[PDB]
Structure formats: C-alpha cells, structure tokens
Design an enzyme around this catalytic site. Structure first.
Site, PDB file in Angstrom:
ATOM      1  CG  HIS A  80     -13.292  10.092 -37.237  1.00 35.29           C
ATOM      2  ND1 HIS A  80     -14.854  10.964 -36.528  1.00 35.29           N
ATOM      3  CD2 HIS A  80     -13.291  10.464 -38.828  1.00 35.29           C
ATOM      4  CE1 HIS A  80     -14.958  11.678 -37.478  1.00 35.29           C
ATOM      5  NE2 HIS A  80     -15.340  11.276 -38.230  1.00 35.29           N
TER       6      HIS A  80
HETATM    7  C1  LIG Z   1     -28.746  21.853 -39.695  1.00 38.46           C
HETATM    8  C2  LIG Z   1     -27.961  22.066 -39.313  1.00 38.46           C
HETATM    9  C3  LIG Z   1     -26.857  21.735 -39.519  1.00 38.46           C
HETATM   10  C4  LIG Z   1     -26.952  21.497 -37.507  1.00 38.46           C
HETATM   11  C5  LIG Z   1     -25.285  20.953 -39.802  1.00 38.46           C
HETATM   12  C6  LIG Z   1     -24.532  20.940 -40.985  1.00 38.46           C
HETATM   13  C7  LIG Z   1     -23.822  21.384 -41.660  1.00 38.46           C
HETATM   14  C8  LIG Z   1     -22.365  20.634 -41.985  1.00 38.46           C
HETATM   15  C9  LIG Z   1     -22.056  19.686 -43.199  1.00 38.46           C
HETATM   16  O1  LIG Z   1     -21.265  21.345 -43.979  1.00 38.46           O
HETATM   17  C10 LIG Z   1     -22.469  21.783 -44.389  1.00 38.46           C
HETATM   18  C11 LIG Z   1     -20.958  18.714 -43.907  1.00 38.46           C
HETATM   19  C12 LIG Z   1     -21.734  18.076 -44.085  1.00 38.46           C
HETATM   20  C13 LIG Z   1     -19.628  18.807 -43.415  1.00 38.46           C
HETATM   21  O2  LIG Z   1     -18.813  19.805 -43.881  1.00 38.46           O
HETATM   22  C14 LIG Z   1     -18.016  20.139 -42.931  1.00 38.46           C
HETATM   23  C15 LIG Z   1     -19.701  17.879 -44.645  1.00 38.46           C
HETATM   24  C16 LIG Z   1     -18.687  17.603 -45.574  1.00 38.46           C
HETATM   25  C17 LIG Z   1     -20.030  15.896 -44.200  1.00 38.46           C
HETATM   26  C18 LIG Z   1     -18.627  15.512 -42.869  1.00 38.46           C
HETATM   27  C19 LIG Z   1     -18.178  14.372 -42.971  1.00 38.46           C
HETATM   28  O3  LIG Z   1     -19.567  13.730 -42.585  1.00 38.46           O
HETATM   29  C20 LIG Z   1     -19.788  12.029 -42.033  1.00 38.46           C
HETATM   30  C21 LIG Z   1     -21.003  11.523 -42.602  1.00 38.46           C
HETATM   31  O4  LIG Z   1     -22.326  11.948 -43.376  1.00 38.46           O
HETATM   32  C22 LIG Z   1     -21.118  10.237 -41.648  1.00 38.46           C
HETATM   33  O5  LIG Z   1     -21.926   9.518 -41.724  1.00 38.46           O
HETATM   34  C23 LIG Z   1     -22.440   8.015 -41.638  1.00 38.46           C
HETATM   35  C24 LIG Z   1     -20.089   9.768 -41.155  1.00 38.46           C
HETATM   36  C25 LIG Z   1     -19.261  10.426 -40.376  1.00 38.46           C
HETATM   37  O6  LIG Z   1     -18.676  10.221 -39.621  1.00 38.46           O
HETATM   38  C26 LIG Z   1     -18.758   8.731 -39.156  1.00 38.46           C
HETATM   39  C27 LIG Z   1     -18.942  11.849 -40.908  1.00 38.46           C
HETATM   40  C28 LIG Z   1     -17.792  12.520 -40.563  1.00 38.46           C
HETATM   41  O7  LIG Z   1     -16.442  12.231 -40.314  1.00 38.46           O
HETATM   42  C29 LIG Z   1     -17.532  13.932 -41.844  1.00 38.46           C
HETATM   43  C30 LIG Z   1     -16.192  14.737 -41.601  1.00 38.46           C
HETATM   44  S1  FES Z   2     -12.879   8.912 -32.961  1.00 37.30           S
HETATM   45 FE1  FES Z   2     -14.284  10.215 -34.202  1.00 37.30          FE
HETATM   46  S2  FES Z   2     -16.533   9.915 -32.700  1.00 37.30           S
HETATM   47 FE2  FES Z   2     -14.725   7.906 -31.869  1.00 37.30          FE
END
Ligand SMILES: C/C=C(C)/C=C/C=C/C(OC)[C@@H](C)[C@H](OC)[C@@H](C)CCc1oc2c(O)c(OC)cc(OC)c2c(=O)c1C
Ligand code: FES
Ligand code: HEC
Lengths: 123, 107, 330, 199, 127, 74, 50
Positions: free
Chosen positions: A89
C-alpha cells in the site's frame, strides 16, 4: 529462538531470517546510515522514536519485517527514505525502520534479543 | 575522577606515513573510549567511538584498537589534512575526562 | 489443503488429472466472468432503478450476495497458495486488525496461529466449500423476493397491462445469451487461460518475501483503490467497506418521481460518469502509488460516494421540477 | 516508477507456437531439452516434470528410459531395513542439481536458482521475456551503473542486477540434429522446451 | 542536518557571571539525546563541564558543580551555560556538543559547536 | 557460426536511427566518465547514469530485430 | 514430549528426557544434514527407523 552469525554479515547488506514464522530484518548499518538514523527530528515522525530507543548497538538494525499496516514484508534498500518500502500500500521506512510515509501507523517492531559475541540470539 | 595519559605528546612526522598515539586509564574503562580531532582553525570533530567504531565521514585509513586500560589511534597516510590535535575520552562513569592532547606537525 | 501439498495438488490437477486443466481454467475464468456479469447485473438495476419501489428487499438481498461472492472468491484464491494467494490471505485477514480493542485477537483467531500457515489454508478451503451453498440459499431468497412483484422493464412503468409467459420466449431468449456467454468463456479457457490472472501465483507462496509485483485480482481493484486513497489505516478499511454498504442508501437518495434513467437526460449523463469513474478507480488500483495517481484516486473516491449521496438526490429533485414546469400552465 | 526498475520491455519474437492453430514445434522442444540438460540443469531443477512426459513429446520410450537410468533414487530398504538406491525409471521426476535450498544458495553466492518448471507462466512476457533475458546480456553495463560484486547487468531483468551470469555462448552444445547451435538458436530452443514444461 | 551556534559574552571581568548560549537547528533539544558543554584550556586540556538531557535533567562535573547552571529555552531551541564568579582560571574556549547513548557503545559527542573563546580580563568593553 | 541476433544488432546499429541513438548514448557515457574523476564523485548523491539512453538504443534495436530474427533460426 | 508436562512429570524432567535423543535439524550454511538434541515440541522416538 534463533542464532544469527553476525560475523558473516558484510557492511551495507540486509539479511532476512525466519523466527516463529515471521521474518527478522538485520542490517549491518554504515556510519552514514547510523548518523542519518540519529539525525532526524521527531516532529517528522508519526511514530516518534530515537534510533537509540530502537537499536542496542548502532551497528546492527534488528527488527520485524512485518509492515504495521496490513502485514506485508517491506522491500530492502528501497523507498524515499533509504530504508524499506512496502509494495502493498506504499509505505515508507527509514534506516531506523521508522514509518515515514504511507498508511502504516507504527515504526517496524523491535523484537527481543541479546548478543553473545559475533552472534545475536533473537527471541 | 579517572584520568587518561596521552603519549607521545605533541609529536611530528612526514607527509605520508603511519603513526600511533595512545591513551592509558587509571581505573578500568572496558572499551568506552572515543577519539576526537581538533583542527588548526578551532573545529572539533568525532573520529572514533567505543574503541573501534568509526563515525560518519572519517576516512577508512583511520584504525583504532585495544581494551581495558591501553588504547590506540592509528593512521595510514597523514596526507594531507591529518595535521591536528587528537584527544581521547572515556565515559564509563561521570565525570568524563579527556586526554592531554597529541599535536601533530608535518616536518 | 495441506499447506505443503496445496500448491502442488493444484498442479497435479493441471498436469495429471484428465481434463484437469479444463476444470481449473474453467473454474478460474468462470470466477472472473461471474464478476463481469455480476457487475453488469448490478449496473442494469442501478440504471433502471430496480432498487426502488417495492423491490428494495430484492436489492438488499442482492447486496448480501455481492459481499458473500467476493468472500467466497477470496477464500478460493487462497487455496492455490501461490505468492498472490499467501499475501492476499495475509492482508485481507489483517483488515480486521483495524478493529480497536479485540483487533489482533480476531486476526490470530482466523489464522489459527502466529501467521498465515497450515491452519489458515485448511480452514479456508473448508469455508470456500461451505459459502457457495449459502450463496445458493441466498439466491432462492433473491428469487422469492423477485417473484412477488415480478421483474421491472426498461420503460420503468407498470408491466401489468401486457404480460407474456416465461416459457417459450424468455426461455429461448435466455438461451441466446447462455450460448454467447459460453462462446466467450471458451475463448479464454482454451486460447487465453491465463490472461485474466496474475503470474506471481505460479510461484509457490513464501512468507519472507512479498513480491514487488503484488496486485489484487482485477475485480477487486476499484475497492483496493478506495482503501489506498485514505492515508489512515482504520479510515482506509472503514471507507472501503462503506463503498460497498453505500449501495443500500440508493432507494432513499433517488428522489425522482419516475423509475429508471430511460427518460432522464441529466441522470443518464451522470450515470455513465459513475460507470467510467468506477473503471478509472479500478485502473488507479493496478497503478503504483505515485504522484498523479494518488490524487486522482482520491478525487475519484470522492466522486464514487458523492454519486449516491449528492448527485442523484440533487439531480433527481431538479429533474422532478424540470418535468413539472416544462408543461404546467396553471 | 523509473524505467530501469520496471526493466526493459521484452519485444515480441514470432514464436512458431503463437497462434490459435499452432502447436509447439516438437523438434525445437527436443533441442531445448539438450540445452537444458547440458547447460541449465547444473543449477536449475525441473521438479514438476516426470520422465514419462517426454515420451511421445520430444523423445522415445527407449530414449527416456535411458536418460532416467542415469540417475539414482531411493528404493525401500532391503530385508534388514538398510537404505538402498535404485536406478531411476519413467514414473520418477527429473532430478534437480541440489539436495536442499542451502546447498543451492551456497553454490550460487547466496542466490537461489528458481525451479524452471513454470517460469514461462510465472513471468510477464513468458517466451519473449525468457528469451530476451538469455540473450540480453551486454558486455558492459551502461555508463554509471554501479554493479554489486557477484552481480551482472541485464537490462530486461527488473532492477538490472541479476545474480545469474551469461551462460549461453556459440557452439557450446552439439545439436544431435545438426542445427547450428548459435547462442540465439539455443535460447529459442530451451524457451520452447520450458514453455512445454510449463504448459 | 544538525547545527550548533555559540553566541555570547566573549570577555568577562572577574567576580561576575559567564553566560554563553548554544542555538540548535535541524533537531530539537527536547527530541534527542544529551546536550553537553566543554572548555578548551590553552594548556591543551579538555574538561567536561556538564550537560542537560532532552527531558531536562542536569549532571555537572564535580569540580564546577556548585557554580554553573545549565538551562534551556524549548521555544527558541537553545541550551545555556552560566558559570558564576569567574576567575582568570576560567579563561578557555568553550564548546557545546550533542552526545548520544546506545546501550552497547556508550556515549560519543557527535555534533559540535563553532567554539566561543571567552577571556577573563579586567579590561573594558562596550556592552 | 556467428550468432543471428548479433549479426542483426550490428546491421541495425549502423542505420540513421541506429547511429543517432548510439551517439546520444555515447555522448552520455562521455559525460559521466568526466564526473567520476572530478572532486569527490564518491560523495554526491546526484550521480547520473546512462541507462535511460541505453534503453532507447536497446529498445530501437529490439523493434527492428524481433520480427526478423526467427526467420534466420531453425 | 510436551504432553507429559503437568501430567506425569515436570517441565524440567521432560526437557531432560527429550534432550537425550537426537532429531534432524535444518542443514547448515552449506547444506550438510546435522542432528540436534530433542525438545518439548517433539514426539517420542521409536526404536526402529522403519
Ligand atoms: C473467512 C473469510 C474472511 C477472513 C474474510 C474475508 C472478507 C473480506 C472481503 O470482503 C468480502 C475482502 C475480499 C475485500 O472486501 C472489502 C475485497 C474488496 C478485497 C480488498 C483487497 O484485496 C487485496 C488482494 O486480493 C490482494 O491480493 C494479493 C492484495 C491486496 O493488497 C496487497 C488486497 C487489498 O489491499 C485489498 C483491500
Ligand atoms: S502498506 Fe499496506 S502492508 Fe505495507
Ligand atoms: C548456475 C551457474 C546457472 C546456470 C548454469 C543457469 N542459471 Fe538460470 N539462474 C541462476 C541463478 C543464480 C538465478 C537467480 C538470479 C536472481 O537474481 O534471482 C537464475 C535465474 C534464472 C531465471 C529466472 C530469473 C528471474 O527472472 O528472476 C531464468 C529465467 C533462468 N535462470 C533461466 C536459465 C536457463 C534457461 C538456463 C540454461 C540455458 C540457466 N538459467 C542456466 C543460475 C544459473
């Protein structure tokens, strides 16, 4: 608990070792890096700390390579502060591992450790 | 109040050859010994800390060794601005005390 | 699901299982198409005001399915345990470390350890299997809510005066798109299986090195972007989750007295401004955190939210009045 | 991000397998195997490729059986429980040059040679990047490039500093089929084999 | 980076006070480590006068311990020196420096001041 | 035999764009060589490198060779 | 081993019974397999290797 051979580590180099599943950063800091670490005003740190509070021996920067934002491992010798840069980030760290720019809220963590000659026992 | 004894005091040498100054403590200072360099103009810099540690900007041709009560400030080639006054201080207990000072002249 | 066997079992599927690659490429690409379609389905409704009138509950159920699908998808992405997998697993679970007091506790609870390790990947497969069946249940409710009022239509007015049975019309009309859909999915699965993916995932996950090439799945980008645009840890996640929840607001901020955008000049305009803005948002996400892009990301995030909260209500009120004065001669 | 950090963009060479109707050129594959075995295999594992997979692809049932029997794998302990080796067979996988990561990192000045089994898919550019890398080694790093000792400059590699040095030189291999083994001819051949290995 | 400027009474008559000021920039007295004062006698002997921490604690050399007083102005960012009742003995050239502390390496005065030479004379000077 | 990619890199290094590009590159290398001798190059934190220009050169040759190279190969 | 601690013996007693046996450890700098004294997180070693 882990033992790292400090005698092995050259000067301007970073070394990564595994401790309890998390990576530990160890840099054999240069005199310029040491000065640059201890010559920075607290006013410019969102998480204030003197390099003295963080390192026990100014020659060795020992810490946890876990970005305090969302947990990525910051890249070495990178960023806009000659330290580490988290590709996740966009967080910036100096040669003290302190948080400068980015979402990361806290300076990299300082683990527990002691020296025993040309080696450090982290843990 | 421990005191260091700098020797050789106010010595001289040529324009490119190694030298060896040295401090000696009355008590024991472990390794807590720094080395300062006082230029002709009046400027006072830091050269070495904790027996061996080099400060920023001090040329690699500056060594340092010893322990306990006997220390040293070595050099490789005094060429050229090495001509100055070299002090030394301890810091294992307050008050800190410096050496007598070792002047350096280019003969 | 075993962390030491996870990545390789997936390759075993690709290399040893008969048609295993067809199974994998279909599942993986089918996942992206699911979103391309889901987005369209959401958009159509957002445009034609399907979230209005008596169909709110319908829309609200749909929003849950969106949150659930994104979750299911991320659980499955972790199962390959490639570099992207591991780090996606890491970052996302950490999203909860933002919760004030219990934070870290919720996180290590999920991991089931000091970090993302075997326990994490094995419970994640377990859950990746479970949610789909819940989504399925959630769908039948979406259908029950649909069934009491029926679908709307492009005119945005009542369809009670001219009805035609589902069978032999829409059963066959649906067939056209089904085939069209399969045709394009086949083009990807057979001739370009990996275009929609990330190469880093073909490298086994490693806990000591986050690749400088880390980028979220294409369908998550806009949301990723919104989070990056807020320099505060907590606000970053609150805003991101808000960007999803804000869709529930729509039936209250659309003040228009008529349904849909078919006859609204100012709305059709501002709708597309939102669509493209959304794409720009997702584009900024694939970009770096560098000078022109950061500010851009912030301006767009503002627009995104400002659409549901300011534009729509302000615009629709004006259109209501505009529609009135344009023909009233009392 | 600076052009150098991203790394030079590998051009698009007209591969004979690029195309909705094109199959890999198996002859090129066969040659590539040889290049891997005689040049790369001294530092790069091919862990995901079992012997049986070359049969009917690049070599013959007899040929592969021979290549396999040139290596020793562990068999079940004898009657008394003592460990005992055995000559490899088709069901086994191609053996890597190192026993562990440490041995591997030791033999390459701290660096770690990635297993080539999926490298084509694990990078952007794939065939193009792989190829441009093997060939892209200038004889001198551009002016002003401070290159770390033990490192080599390659423009196509992100950051410019790659731990792998140039290994492909003209005629360093004698292609069984006659083909002139020029450095770019060898590069083309392994890459096509590596592409097969991955896909 | 860090800078230390020394300013003040460069000549003082006996039975009076010696007041020297040390202005710091590029770092805050409150933020950092230790702020010391040392004098340089013509006889070429350096004497450690005393310091004031970033917290506000003093530690003076047992010798001068009952004459000197080291204070500071957080607002102007500068620490002082006030040696009461001076004699021809106190004639030397004073320096203000910053010394760090690290658990393993101890102290070390890294950043020094220009160096102000005070002379204790009975002569006259326009204030 | 002489490598096919080299033979082509040479023919294209000697074309108008080729010579222009290598010139800009060489005018850069020559500018850096100077800096390196100059007073305190080791301490400057501004050191210019000629990567950008090496890239324009290299890129150009890539564009020229890439669609041709494989016709010469087996 | 750890499962005995607090059931039949003490933390010290177990650590001591464990350390009497060697277990495989991560190879050193050059990748040479080396042994190590047992630890609480380990499992009681059997008498036969296979
Ligand atoms: C058992 C279930 C559990 C523990 C929790 C799950 C629920 C969480 C979500 O919503 C359902 C979640 C998917 C979220 O929603 C806000 C999505 C928009 C994803 C946002 C998301 O993705 C990333 C990603 O894929 C990456 O790949 C390598 C890398 C990432 O940064 C390095 C990110 C990231 O920085 C963010 C904000
Ligand atoms: S800035 Fe998001 S993990 Fe380092
Ligand atoms: C040992 C002397 C090697 C030989 C012989 C070959 N390679 Fe290699 N390779 C080696 C190292 C030390 C590394 C790691 C460098 C780093 O900085 O990561 C590599 C790496 C590669 C890669 C991937 C590099 C990347 O993009 O990160 C490729 C694509 C690769 N090597 C291919 C390759 C081929 C095909 C070889 C035979 C012709 C070959 N290598 C030989 C060490 C050595």
């Amino acid at each position: 608990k882990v033992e790292v051979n400090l005698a092995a580590i050259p000067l301007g180099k970073n070394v990564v070792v595994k401790w309890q599943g998390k990576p530990v950063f160890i840099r054999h800091r240069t005199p310029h890096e040491i000065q640059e670490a201890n010559s920075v005003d607290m006013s410019a740190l969102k998480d204030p700390q003197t390099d003295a509070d963080r390192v026990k021996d100014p020659q060795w920067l020992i810490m946890l390579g876990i970005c305090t934002h969302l947990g990525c491992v910051p890249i070495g010798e990178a960023g806009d502060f000659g330290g580490w840069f988290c590709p996740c980030h966009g967080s910036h760290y100096d040669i003290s591992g302190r948080i400068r720019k980015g979402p990361a809220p806290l300076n990299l963590e300082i683990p527990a450790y002691e020296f025993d000659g040309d080696k450090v026992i982290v843990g | 109040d421990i005191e260091l004894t700098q020797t050789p005091v106010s010595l001289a040498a040529s324009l490119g050859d190694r030298v060896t100054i040295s401090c000696r403590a009355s008590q024991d200072i472990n390794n807590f010994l720094n080395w300062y360099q006082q230029k002709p103009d009046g400027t006072i810099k830091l050269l070495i800390y904790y027996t061996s540690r080099l400060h920023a900007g001090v040329p690699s041709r500056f060594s340092g060794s010893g322990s306990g009560t006997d220390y040293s400030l070595t050099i490789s080639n005094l060429e050229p601005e090495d001509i100055a006054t070299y002090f030394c201080q301890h810091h294992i207990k307050f008050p800190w005390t410096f050496g007598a000072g070792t002047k350096l002249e280019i003969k | 699901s075993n962390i030491e066997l996870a990545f390789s079992s997936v390759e075993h599927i690709m290399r040893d299982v008969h048609n295993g690659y067809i199974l994998r490429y279909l599942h993986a690409n089918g996942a992206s198409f699911f979103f391309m379609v889901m987005f369209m389905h959401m958009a159509k409704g957002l445009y034609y005001g399907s979230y209005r009138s008596p169909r709110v509950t319908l829309w609200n159920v749909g929003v849950i399915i969106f949150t659930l699908t994104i979750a299911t998808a991320f659980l499955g992405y972790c199962c390959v345990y490639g570099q992207m997998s591991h780090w996606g697993a890491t970052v996302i679970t950490n999203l909860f470390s933002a919760i004030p007091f219990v934070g870290n506790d919720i996180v290590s609870w999920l991991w089931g350890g000091f970090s993302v390790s075997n326990p994490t990947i094995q419970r994640f497969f377990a859950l990746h299997y479970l949610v789909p069946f819940i989504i399925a249940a959630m769908v039948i409710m979406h259908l029950m809510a649909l069934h009491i009022h029926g679908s709307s239509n492009p005119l945005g007015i009542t369809g009670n005066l001219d009805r035609i049975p589902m069978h032999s019309y829409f059963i066959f009309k649906d067939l056209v798109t089904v085939f069209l859909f399969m045709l394009i999915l086949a083009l990807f699965v057979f001739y370009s299986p990996n275009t929609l993916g990330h190469p880093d995932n073909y490298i086994p996950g490693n806990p000591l090195v986050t690749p400088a090439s880390i980028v979220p799945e294409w369908y998550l980008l806009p949301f990723y972007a919104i989070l990056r645009s807020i320099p505060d840890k907590l606000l970053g996640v609150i805003t991101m989750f808000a960007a999803i929840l804000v869709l529930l607001v729509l039936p209250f901020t659309d003040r228009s007295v008529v349904r849909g955008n078919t006859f609204k000049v100012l709305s059709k305009f501002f709708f597309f401004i939102f669509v493209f803005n959304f794409v720009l948002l997702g584009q900024i996400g694939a970009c770096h955190v560098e000078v022109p892009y950061v500010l851009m990301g912030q301006i767009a995030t503002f627009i995104y939210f400002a659409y549901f909260l300011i534009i729509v209500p302000v615009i629709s009120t004006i259109e209501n009045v505009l529609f009135y004065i344009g023909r009233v001669n009392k | 991000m600076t052009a150098a950090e991203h790394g030079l963009h590998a051009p698009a060479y007209a591969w004979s397998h690029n195309g909705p109707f094109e199959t890999f050129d198996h002859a090129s594959i066969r040659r590539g195997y040889q290049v891997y075995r005689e040049v790369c295999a001294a530092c790069h594992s091919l862990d995901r490729v079992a012997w049986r997979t070359l049969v009917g692809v690049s070599h013959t049932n007899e040929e592969v059986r021979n290549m396999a029997e040139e290596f020793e794998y562990d068999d079940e302990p004898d009657e008394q429980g003592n460990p005992k080796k055995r000559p490899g067979k088709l069901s086994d996988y191609i053996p890597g040059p190192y026993p562990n990561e440490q041995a591997a990192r030791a033999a390459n000045q701290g660096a770690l040679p990635p297993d080539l089994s999926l490298i084509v898919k694990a990078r952007h550019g794939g065939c193009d990047y792989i190829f441009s890398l093997l060939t892209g080694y200038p004889d001198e790093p551009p002016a002003g490039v401070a290159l770390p000792p033990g490192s080599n400059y390659n423009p196509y590699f992100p950051g410019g500093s790659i731990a792998m040095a140039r290994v492909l030189f003209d005629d360093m291999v004698e292609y069984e089929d006659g083909t002139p083994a020029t450095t770019s001819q060898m590069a083309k051949d392994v890459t096509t084999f590596l592409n097969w290995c991955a896909e | 980076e860090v800078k230390l400027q020394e300013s003040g009474a460069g000549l003082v008559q006996p039975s009076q006070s010696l007041s020297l000021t040390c202005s710091v920039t590029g770092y805050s007295i409150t933020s950092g480590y230790y702020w010391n004062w040392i004098r340089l006698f013509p006889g070429n002997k350096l004497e450690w006068v005393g310091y004031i921490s970033n917290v506000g604690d003093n530690n003076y050399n047992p010798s001068l311990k009952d004459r000197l007083s080291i204070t500071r102005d957080t607002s102007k960012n500068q620490f002082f020196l006030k040696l009461n009742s001076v004699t021809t003995e106190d004639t030397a050239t004073y320096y203000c420096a910053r010394s760090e502390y690290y658990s393993v390496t101890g102290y070390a005065m890294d950043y020094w001041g220009q160096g102000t030479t005070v002379t204790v004379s009975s002569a006259w000077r326009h204030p | 035999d002489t490598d096919q990619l080299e033979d082509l890199r040479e023919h294209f290094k000697n074309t108008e764009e080729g010579k222009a590009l290598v010139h800009h590159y060489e005018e850069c290398a020559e500018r850096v060589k100077i800096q390196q001798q100059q007073p305190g190059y080791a301490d400057l934190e501004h050191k210019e490198d000629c990567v950008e220009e090496f890239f324009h050169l290299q890129h150009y040759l890539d564009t020229a060779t890439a669609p041709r190279l494989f016709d010469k190969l087996k």
